Amino acid sequence: KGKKRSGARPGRPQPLRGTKGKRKGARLWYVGGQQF
Amino acid sequence: KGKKRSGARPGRPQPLRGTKGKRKGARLWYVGGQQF
Amino acid sequence: KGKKRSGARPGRPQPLRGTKGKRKGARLWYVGGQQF
Amino acid sequence: MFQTFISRHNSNFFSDKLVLTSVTPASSAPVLQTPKATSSTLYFDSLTVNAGNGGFLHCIQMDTSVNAANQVVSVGADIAFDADPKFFACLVRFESSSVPTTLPTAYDVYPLNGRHDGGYYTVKDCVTIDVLPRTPGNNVYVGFMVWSNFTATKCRGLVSLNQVIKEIICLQPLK
Amino acid sequence: MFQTFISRHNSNFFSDKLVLTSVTPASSAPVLQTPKATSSTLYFDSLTVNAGNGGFLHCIQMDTSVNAANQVVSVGADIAFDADPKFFACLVRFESSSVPTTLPTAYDVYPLNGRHDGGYYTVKDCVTIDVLPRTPGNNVYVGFMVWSNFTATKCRGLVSLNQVIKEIICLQPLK
Amino acid sequence: MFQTFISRHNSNFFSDKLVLTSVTPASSAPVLQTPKATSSTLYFDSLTVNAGNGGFLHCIQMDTSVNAANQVVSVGADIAFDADPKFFACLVRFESSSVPTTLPTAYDVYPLNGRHDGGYYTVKDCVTIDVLPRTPGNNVYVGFMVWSNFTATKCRGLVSLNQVIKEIICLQPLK
Amino acid sequence: SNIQTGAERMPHDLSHLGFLAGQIGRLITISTTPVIAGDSFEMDAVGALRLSPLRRGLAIDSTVDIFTFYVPHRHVYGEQWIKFMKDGVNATPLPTVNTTGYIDHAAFLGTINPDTNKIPKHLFQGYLNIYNNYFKAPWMPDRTEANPNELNQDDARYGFRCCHLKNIWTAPLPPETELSRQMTTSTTSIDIMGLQAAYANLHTDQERDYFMQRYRDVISSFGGKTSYDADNRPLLVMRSNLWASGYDVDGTDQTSLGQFSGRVQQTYKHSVPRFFVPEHGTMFTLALVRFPPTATKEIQYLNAKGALTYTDIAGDPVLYGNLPPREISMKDVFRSGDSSKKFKIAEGQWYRYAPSYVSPAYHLLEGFPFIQEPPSGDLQERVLIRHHDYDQCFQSVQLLQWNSQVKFNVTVYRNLPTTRDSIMTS
Amino acid sequence: RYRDVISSFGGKTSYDADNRPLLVMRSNLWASGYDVDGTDQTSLGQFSGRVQQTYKHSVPRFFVPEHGTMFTLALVRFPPTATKEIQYLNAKGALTYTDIAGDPVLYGNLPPREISMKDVFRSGDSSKKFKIAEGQWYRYAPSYVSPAYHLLEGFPFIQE
DNA sequence: AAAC
DNA sequence: AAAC
DNA sequence: AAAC
DNA sequence: AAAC
Prior knowledge:
The structure is cut from a larger assembly and holds three copies of chain A, three copies of chain D and two copies of chain G.
Chain A lengths: L36
Chain D lengths: L1 E2 L2 E2 L8 E2 L4 E2 L15 E11 L2 E10 L8 E12 L6 E9 L11 E3 L4 E3 L2 E11 L8 E12 L2 E11 L12
Parallel strand pairs in D: 3-5, 4-5
Antiparallel strand pairs in D: 5-13, 6-12, 7-11, 7-13, 8-9, 8-12, 10-11
Chain G lengths: L9 E4 L2 E7 L3 E10 L4 E12 L10 E11 H5 L1 H9 L8 E3 L19 E3 H15 L17 H6 L1 E2 L30 H19 L4 H8 L12 E10 L2 E4 L9 E4 L1 E12 L4 E10 L10 H4 L5 H4 L3 H4 L5 E4 L12 E4 L33 H5 L18 E13 L4 H5 L3
Antiparallel strand pairs in G: 1-16, 2-16, 3-8, 3-13, 4-12, 4-16, 5-9, 5-13, 6-7, 10-11, 14-15
Chain G binds four DNA strands through α6 and α11.
GO molecular function (chain G): structural molecule activity
Organism (chain G): Enterobacteria phage phiX174
GO cellular component, one term (chain G): T=1 icosahedral viral capsid
C-alpha cells in the first residue's frame, strides 16, 4: 500500500526518448531474418 | 512591539504552493471515512 | 583639484533606491508626534 | 495561411430583435431599445424612419466596476436605408442618472472608420472612451448614432456594441 | 517585401456548384444547399431571386468534436445582384436537431466587416462563435445570410465559410 | 478573439459643436473654428457651403514643448455633403505667428488614406509631420482640408485631429 | 452528565493564502486573525509584491511597509465588552457596524462585504484606532466615522490616505505653530520677573506643539511610561520595511524595439515573533506602498525666493539658533506653487535639506512615478498622498496600482477542545 | 464503512473481506513552471504562465497473488480558493458569547452547528445548510482574495 | 482560583 | 523626542 | 480515527 | 536466432 508521493522530480522536462522499458529479456519478433 | 523590516527576501518570486501552515496539529475534518 | 575619472562602475544599472544619503545625523522633522 | 486571431469587434453570442417599428429622428435622438449593460447586438429587418432632422442611436450601459478610467468600446454594424439619407455616423457618449429614452443635451462624439455607399453603411471599429461617470450619480452610455435631415424612409440591419472590460477566448489549434 | 502569411479566411481547396436555381426569400430563410460539416465554398453563376421579404443563406455544420466552446468561423464572399436590393448581410448561428432547409425561428446574428456597393457585396471576415449546441440534442449551424425586401432579380457569386478547428500550413520559403 | 489595442487615431474624450453655420470656400481657406492646442474633435450637423472655388479646414495648434522634430498627427472624420462636390481631401500644415482665420499663402499638403463615395467622406489616418516652427516666431497648425469648385450646398459630420505627443492608456484585461 | 470541562493548549494552524491589490498611499488590511485570551500567536508572511505594469523601464524603487497590530476588544467595545465577558453565556450579542451595498466597500478591512451589509464593529473600529494613532499627521483630527457606510468609495475600497515621506513641504511644522508671543506689559515698565515666567510658559506650549500633541508623549517627557491600555492604542507588534524592485522587459517587434517595460517582482517576508495575547482581540496586518515624494517642479528654496538677505545666505548660527519659525508659501519651493498656500519651516531648514532634481525634460513624460503639479490645497490635502498622482505611471489594469500574492503561515497555541471532543456528545 | 467499524474494535480486515481495490502506491506533487514575457507593441507588460512539471511515480515491486489489472490514475486539483468566502465571525450577524469567547467548556459540549452557505459566502444561498463543529471558525482560516480579483480571468479561483 |  |  |  |  501506497504512500509517499514524488513527482517533485526537479528538472526541465525532457522529450520522450524511447518506449522500451528499463530491463528487457528474451527476443519478441521473428520476421524471417534481420530487418533494420 | 514592531521593528526591523525584512521583505528584502532576495529571490525570484515563487508561485503560491499550498495554503497549509507550517506546523499542524490535530485532525479537523470528519466525513464518515477516508476521502482522497 | 580634480583628477581620476571612475564611472567605470562595472555593473547592470540598479533602480534608484532611496534619496537619503549615507550618513545621517540629527532629527529634521517635527510634526507633533510619531507619523509613519 | 495562419489564422488571424485578433479583431476590433467581438459581438456578443446572443443578438436581440428591435421591438420598435418607426423612429422619428430628432435632436433628442431617441434611444432605439432600453440599454443593456456591457455588450448587445440589435437587429431590425425593417425600421420606418419618419422625416426628421436629428438622429437615432443604439446604446449599451458602461459596466463601471473595474476602476479603469479608459476602456475600449467596439462597434459592429451593417445597415441599409431604402433611400440615401446622406447621413454622418459616429459613437456617442452620454451620461444619465436614469434609464435614457433620448439623447441628453450633453454628449460627446467620436468618428469611426466606416464606409458609406449610398444608403448602405458598414463599420467594425473600437474607440477608447472615459467610461466612468464624469458626474458622481450618473450612468455612462455609449452608442452608435446616425444623424441627418431624414425623409420618410425605411432601414434594415444590425448594430453591435461591446465594452472591452474582459477579453474573449477562442480555440487556437496550435496551443 | 515579405509575404503576408496571415489571413482572416482560408477557403477550402474544393468549391461546389449550387445545384438550385431560384430562391424566394423569406422569414424562414431557405438554406441554399444541404450543409457540409466544417468548411464549404459554394458558387453560383446565376441564381434567380424571387420577390420576397426575408433572406436566404449558405450554411456549414459546426464540427463539435473538440470540446472548445468558442471557435472562429470565417466567411469569404463576392456577390453581384442584377439590381440593388438594398439588403443587410450577416453571419447567422442556429441549431437544429435535423438537417435544416430553412432558418429556424431562433437564431443569432453577427455583423461582418464587408463592403456594399450598389448590388455588389464582398467580405473576408471571421467571428468567434459559441460552436457547441446550446441545447443537448442539436447540431449548430453557422451561415452567411442576405436579408431584404427582395424584388425578382438575379445574382452571381461565391460564398465560403470555414470553422477554424485546425490551422492550414503553407510553404514559408525562409524556414 | 483577442482585442485589437492599436489605433491610427485616438479622438479626444470631449468634442465641440461648430459654432459657425456657413462657409464660403476659398483659396484663403477659412479656418472653421479657432484652433485648440493638441487634439480637438469638431462636429456640425448642418453647415452651409456657399458656392466657392477653394477649400475650408479644421485646425489644431501643434504643442511645441517636446523638442522632437517629427511627430505623428492623426485625423478621424465622417462627412456627408447634400450634393457631391467632387472634392479632394488632405492634411494641411501651415504656420502663422497669430491665430489664423484663413489658410496662409504658404502651406504643405499630405494625402490621407480615406474613402470617397459620392458626397460621403470618411478617414482614420496619421501622418508624421515636422511639428516645430520652420520659422522662429510662428506657431505651426495642422488641419483637415476639403477643396473643390463648390456649389451652394450643405454638410454634416465630425472631424477629429490629434497630435501624438503622448500616448493614451486603456484597460488591457490580461495585464 | 459530566462534560468536557478542560482543554489542553496545542498548536492551531490558521495559515491561509492572501490575493491582494491596492493603490499607492492608502493603508489597507491584508490579514486579520481573531485571538483568544491566553493564546500565543506567531506568523510568517512570505509572498511577492508586484506593481501594475509600468509604461517605461524601472527608474525608482518604491518602499513597502507591512505592519501587525494587536487590538484588544475592550479597546473597541469598552464597558460593553467587560460586561459581555462577565455576563458570559447570556451576554447580549455584540454590536455590528454598517457597510454600503457593494462587494468592495469593506475591502479596506481586508474582507468581502457580507450580503446583509454589516460587519463586527471591532473590525471597523480597530482600523480607525490604528490609523488615528500611527498614520494621520499628529495635528490632523481623528477619523471618527460611526459606520463604514459613511466613507467614499476610494476610502472604503482602497484604505485611508497616508502621509508622504518627510520633506520640507511634506513635513512642515504643525499648522498652529506660533510665530510670536505677546506678554501684556504695562505702559512704562515691564516686570523682569513676569517676563521670565512668560518664557517658562511658552516653553511648555512649544513642546506640546512640536513633540507632545498626544498624551502618551507628554508623559514620556516626564520620564514616565504609559501602557497601551492607558490611552487605548493598538499595540504595534511587528513592522517590516522594504524596497520593491524587478527588471525591464525589452520589446522586440518592428515598432517597439528600443522600448522597455519595468517589471517589479519583489519577494518579501513579514515575521511576527511569538506573541502572548493577554485578552481576546484581533491581530490586524496592513500594507502601505509608497514612492519618495519627488515632484517634477520643486525648486531649492534659496533659488526661488527672491533677493538673498544675510539671514538667508550666511549660515550664521546665532541667527538660526534664535528666531521664530519662518512662514513660507508653496510658491517659494515650486514652479506653479500657490503663493496663497503657506507653511512654517525652521529657520535654516534650507541648509539641512536638499530636494531631488528632475530635469524639465521629464515634466509630463508618462511612466515615471513623479508628482506632476504641486499639490494644491490645505496643508492636510498636501501631506496626504493622492493615488491618482500616480495614474500616468502604469499600464491600466484591473488590479489597481500594486498586487501581492502571499502565504500567511500562522500558528496559534490556543486551548480549545479538539474538533471531535466538539462533535462527540460523550 | 464496514472496514472502519472493525478497525475500531482493534481488528483488521483484508481487502478481500470488503472487496476493495488495494492501493499499492501514491505520489503527490505540486506542478509549477515559468512565465513567458510578451514583447510586441501591444503585449509588452503582459505574461503567460507556463506550467511544466517533471514528476516520477514509482511503484516498488509487487507480488500479484491472483490474476487482475493494475490501474494507474491521475487527479489534478487546485486548493478551493473562492473569490467571495467570508470569515464566519465576520459574516453571521451580532456575535454572541458562544461565538466570540473561545470558551472551552462550551465548544467541548454542545451539538454540531447548522450553518448556511450565506454565513461564509457573499452570494451564498441561505437556503443551503451544512453542519459544522462548534468552534470550527477558531480552528480554520479561509484564504482572502481582494474584491479587485473577482471576475478577473486567468486565476484559478472559484467565481461564485 | 487545590483548574481539562 | 539629537532632551537640564 | 489527535481513541478508555 | 533467449538454439539439443
